[PDB]
């Protein structure tokens, strides 16, 4: 259902989430890091999956690449989620960010 297959540039990385093999929104991990806070106000720091650590440096191509399987399996851990995946603030953002992709 959830994907990450590619990845880009310019500064800073953007991963694109494919809804069933098609792209469908193209973001930044700010800004999933802002909607995993968004989530854990709301409904707390219990039953939210884990969300990929901050970094201190730019990122290693070997790095990008993990951060990508990591938000690639955290995205479809919320979209599994019975209270998480039908939340408003998840949804919303899911549509924004379709919108958004010009
Ligand atoms: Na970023």
Same mark, same amino acid.
């Given at each position: ?28 991990? %700010?800004?999933?890091?802002? &909607? ?47 209270? &998480?995946?039908? %939340? ?15």
């Amino acid at each position: 259902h959830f994907s990450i297959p590619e990845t880009e540039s310019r500064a800073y990385v953007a991963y694109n989430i494919h809804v069933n093999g098609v792209l469908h929104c193209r973001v930044r991990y %700010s800004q999933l890091l802002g &909607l995993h806070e968004q989530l854990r106000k709301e409904y707390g720091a219990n039953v939210l999956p884990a969300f990929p650590p901050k970094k201190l440096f730019s990122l290693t191509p070997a790095e990008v690449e993990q951060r990508r399987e990591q938000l690639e399996k955290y995205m479809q851990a919320v979209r599994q989620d019975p209270l &998480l995946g039908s %939340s408003e603030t998840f949804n919303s953002f899911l549509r924004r960010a379709q919108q958004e992709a010009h």
